[PDB]
Design a protein around this nucleic acid. Structure first.
Lengths: 132, 93, 297, 52, 118, 227
DNA sequence: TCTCCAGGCACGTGTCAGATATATACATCCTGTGCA
DNA sequence: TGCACAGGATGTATATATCTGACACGTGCCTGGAGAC
């Protein structure tokens, strides 16, 4: 029985801010990213770490997309474009999804089936973090 | 136009218990309670200032009135809270 | 302008006899225009524009007041719905005195429902009536219903019943209907049950009922055809149904027959996170990447 | 005075009773954001290139 | 692997075909050229629609470069862009590319058509 | 994770190895407004930028992550009644019609609303939780607007004397409660003023608990007809 | 003591908690009847 | 005369459907607390 901390909602604001010396050699280009998430009967704002923002921008999210952030590993899933805007003006065969129910911040319990060999090969070849 | 303390004590309850409701009669008891406590403390302070032939009420006579009225561990916690509040307010520099 | 005029004349003759009438035709022929013609004909007969209680379910309350306003706008309308202050000002409105009949009155036609006949029995115990019609009285069939109990306490001395299908045959529904129609004559259910079983039952209620069937008019109503569609069981529905059979629990059987996700909802398919991280043991919120491994060297 | 107040109360009450009796599209496009990005315009008669 | 190479799966897909004449192309790219987006205005003899473009669509446009008056065909599910030819036959042209495409007519009727492919 | 208790140099070395700025900048990209700020408002040339955008692209959009959200097509294929209802509704919408569906559960129409919003069909809902004012203007928009398609209803609300002359096709999802209340259900629908052929569809699942009470319902029909 | 603006008051509107009702199949309990 | 088996009666179980019922939030306003001398 596995418990997941989940942030989810519709992206409404995606605003980064810059570092003082981007060519300083050490430290990334940006310092924080402000993300505005809206779900059903709720709305939250988050100040993202840059390491989370690498996985956010690797999924190629934008303003008007419904996302799904898993706080256990930092993995981000881009669900699809929101249906609150228009539909028939796209050319990339995307999937249109309503707003997620409930609050933005959630905790849910998930029952998983896992063999010991799966844990062995997960720890032997580590894929699933956000590191190099 | 009438005066009550209700929003302040409501906020005090939401700081420690967010999911708790309120009877209006409970506000009537607790408003009477805070007014009665203010009543005894203020006339104890005025009585003590009239004792010392002073025409001024400051923090020290109400400190002595709090020491007189409240029981000892409540007295020490109350003067701790009051001293930290008045030293925070006095740092307007 | 149709054959319900003969039925209303029959009901007026039964009212002139002195007994409470029976109408149990199924809906689809418009008994509402029949009832407003009954009210108009009695108002043309003995010159009464007075108060008229009618019990009606709340789904068709607005439809009935709409058809009253559209059909015959001579009478006055005083509905009953809303909040208790609106109920108080309607209690201010209907304050009649000296009984009988009034010409300049605002309480000519008023509405109600069963749910506030039940809950406002103290205010409605007084003010004896002259006409109460129980429109769509299919829900009266329980003998222990308090709505039937404070419907029995009215001093109206009229019990004209409107319903579609009274043939639920629970053996106390028919005695309850006969007790509501004639209160003095029908008071014992044991003598009703004690006093061939098919022909006599037709002749029990023969002078009261009138035989009208939908298949007498021009059938442009549609002539409904029953198309029964059968489906098989999917393997998720098969698994939940064999689990429910292994437990044998009826509502669970229905709610897994229609759709599997009424019992449990399918959730996100994610890999099992073999991490230890910063979790909450509960103008923005800060989140930082903090996943580590449980294995420490 | 009393008759006028009774008439006003009856008028407001009848208005409330009448209110109780008689009273009781294309989706917008997605927001397009292009800040600090170059522009290529290929119109019908001329081609443009806006740079920084 | 030799066993599993001999089992075939026939997959059915729903696609949408768009054939029309290009009117206006707007392409917005960042300074390094990584993040690409823009709008496409295509027309037939009856309708006129503005579409939104992603990265793969912009990559398919900037290859076999369309020049605002070519008749193109786009498959939505496959992401294939085919330049059928030029209908406007503009006189003023730059002297670098050939642009010697065949003369076709502007298509008429519905701009978008649903199709089933396997 | 490797830990050395009481040393800060190992933490700095581990944080430098795991989160190397050069490699992590190589596996990502700078935002566009940040690039505009450094190229224009800071005077940094393009060739002095850090190397970005070397992460290889996935095959699809689906292949970019390991998290799979509950699907909608599956929501429709694990229930046979909903699947056959979808198959019938495709040709019903192709015919250009008006249709009522009756229900018995709250969530049985709550999920059916989700199916309609997946199909982007025009629909409005009337149930027990609806306020008394809504049962006026909803019926008004039903009998006036022809562009409405689906009318989700319960039994005792939408089946008691309400004028439903603008519909002929009624579908019974699971309404097998009593023969009398079911017989009253199309009495709101099959009424005077109908202009075309009235068809009633009663979908049911076979060899199940549906057959356990449908025989009793037919027995009650025969008993209430002979009596 | 002069000035001045927003804090807390006063008055409207929606949203999860209780209450009758359907309802049929299953399980259990009570009662009648036949047998040793 | 007592006991065991079978049949009928009734409780109930859990999701409904209507359906209120008493609570928490979004706008005016004015006057009294705060700044300055």
């Amino acid at each position: 029985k596995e418990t997941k901390e989940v942030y989810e909602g519709e992206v409404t604001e995606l605003t980064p801010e810059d570092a003082e010396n981007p060519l300083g050699g050490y430290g990334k280009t940006i310092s924080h990213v402000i993300v505005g998430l809206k779900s059903a009967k709720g709305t939250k704002t988050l100040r993202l770490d840059p390491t989370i923002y690498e996985s956010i921008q690797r999924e190629k999210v934008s303003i008007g997309d419904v996302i799904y952030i898993e706080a256990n590993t930092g993995a981000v899933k881009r669900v699809g474009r929101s249906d609150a805007y228009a539909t028939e003006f796209d050319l990339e065969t995307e999937e249109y999804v309503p707003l997620p129910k409930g609050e933005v911040h959630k905790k849910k319990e998930i029952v998983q089936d896992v063999t010991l060999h799966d844990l062995d090969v997960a720890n032997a070849r580590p894929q699933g973090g956000q590191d190099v | 136009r009438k005066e009550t303390y209700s929003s302040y004590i409501y906020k005090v309850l939401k700081q420690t218990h967010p999911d708790t409701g309120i009877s209006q009669k409970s506000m009537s008891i607790l408003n009477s309670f805070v007014n009665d406590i203010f009543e005894r403390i203020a006339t104890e302070a005025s009585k003590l200032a009239a004792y010392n032939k002073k025409s001024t009420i400051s923090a020290r006579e109400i400190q002595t009135a709090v020491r007189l009225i409240l029981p000892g561990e409540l007295a020490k916690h109350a003067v701790s809270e009051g001293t930290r509040a008045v030293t925070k307010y006095s740092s307007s520099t | 302008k149709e054959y319900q005029l003969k039925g209303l004349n029959w009901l007026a003759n039964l009212y002139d006899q002195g007994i409470n009438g029976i109408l149990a035709d199924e809906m689809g022929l418009g008994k509402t225009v029949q009832s407003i013609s009954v009210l108009a004909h009695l108002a043309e007969n003995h010159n009464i524009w007075g108060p008229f209680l009618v019990v009606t379910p709340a789904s068709t309350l607005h439809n009935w007041v709409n058809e009253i306003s559209k059909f015959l706008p001579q009478f006055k309308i005083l509905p009953y719905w809303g909040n208790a202050n609106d109920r108080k000002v309607l209690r201010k409105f209907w304050d009649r005195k000296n009984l009988r009949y009034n010409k300049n009155a605002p309480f000519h036609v008023m509405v109600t429902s069963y749910q506030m006949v039940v809950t406002d029995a103290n205010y409605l115990q007084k003010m004896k009536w002259q006409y109460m019609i129980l429109d769509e009285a299919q829900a009266i069939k329980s003998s222990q219903s308090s709505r039937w109990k404070n419907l029995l306490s009215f001093h109206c001395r009229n019990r004209l019943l409107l319903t579609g299908t009274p043939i639920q045959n629970s053996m106390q529904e028919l005695w309850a209907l006969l007790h509501f129609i004639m209160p003095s004559l029908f008071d014992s259910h044991d003598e009703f049950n004690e006093w061939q079983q098919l022909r006599r039952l037709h002749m029990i209620l023969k002078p009261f009922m009138l035989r009208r069937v939908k298949k007498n008019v021009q059938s442009e109503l549609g002539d409904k055809i029953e198309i029964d569609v059968l489906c098989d069981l999917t393997q998720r529905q098969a698994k939940l149904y064999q689990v429910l059979k292994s437990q044998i629990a009826v509502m669970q059987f229905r709610k897994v027959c229609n759709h599997p996700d009424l019992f449990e909802r399918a959730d996100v398919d994610s890999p099992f996170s073999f991490t230890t991280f910063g979790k909450t043991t509960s103008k923005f919120t800060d989140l930082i990447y903090s996943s580590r491994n449980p294995i420490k060297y | 005075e009393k008759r006028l107040e009774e008439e006003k109360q009856d008028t407001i009450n009848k208005l409330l009773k009448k209110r109780a009796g008689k009273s009781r599209f294309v989706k917008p496009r997605r927001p397009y954001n292009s800040e600090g990005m170059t522009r290529i315009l290929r119109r019908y008669e001329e081609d443009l290139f806006c740079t920084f | 692997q030799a066993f599993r190479k001999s089992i075939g799966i026939k997959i059915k897909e729903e696609t949408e075909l768009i054939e029309g004449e290009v009117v206006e192309i707007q392409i917005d790219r960042s300074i390094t050229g990584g993040h690409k987006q823009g709008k496409l205005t295509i027309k037939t003899t009856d309708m006129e629609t503005i579409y939104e473009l992603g990265n793969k669509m912009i990559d398919g446009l900037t290859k076999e470069k369309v020049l605002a008056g070519d008749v193109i065909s786009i498959d939505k599910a496959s992401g294939k862009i085919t330049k059928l030819g030029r209908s406007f036959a503009r006189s003023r042209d730059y002297d670098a590319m050939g642009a010697d495409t065949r003369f076709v007519q502007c298509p008429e009727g519905e701009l978008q058509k649903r199709k089933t492919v396997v | 994770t490797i830990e050395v208790l009481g040393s800060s140099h190992v933490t700095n070395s581990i944080n430098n190895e795991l989160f190397d700025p050069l490699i992590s900048q190589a596996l990502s990209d700078i935002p566009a407004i940040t690039q505009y700020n450094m190229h224009v408002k800071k005077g940094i040339p393009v060739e002095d930028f850090p190397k970005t955008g070397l992460f290889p692209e996935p095959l699809n959009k689906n292949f970019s992550s390991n998290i799979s959200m509950p699907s909608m097509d599956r929501f429709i294929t694990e229930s046979a009644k909903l699947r056959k209802l979808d198959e019938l509704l495709v040709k019903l919408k192709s015919e250009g019609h008006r249709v009522l569906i009756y229900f018995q559960m709250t969530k049985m129409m709550d999920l059916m609303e989700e199916y309609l919003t997946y199909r982007q069909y025009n629909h409005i809902r009337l149930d027990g939780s609806s306020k008394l004012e809504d049962r006026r203007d909803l019926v008004h928009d039903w009998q006036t607007n022809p562009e409405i398609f689906v009318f989700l209803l319960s039994t005792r609300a939408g089946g008691l004397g309400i004028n439903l002359t603008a519909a002929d096709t009624v579908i019974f999802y699971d309404s097998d409660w009593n023969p009398t209340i079911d017989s009253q259900a199309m009495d709101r629908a099959h009424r005077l003023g109908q202009t075309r052929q009235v068809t009633v569809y009663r979908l049911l699942v076979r060899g199940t608990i549906e057959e356990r009470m449908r025989d009793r319902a037919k027995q009650k029909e025969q008993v209430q007809q002979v009596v």
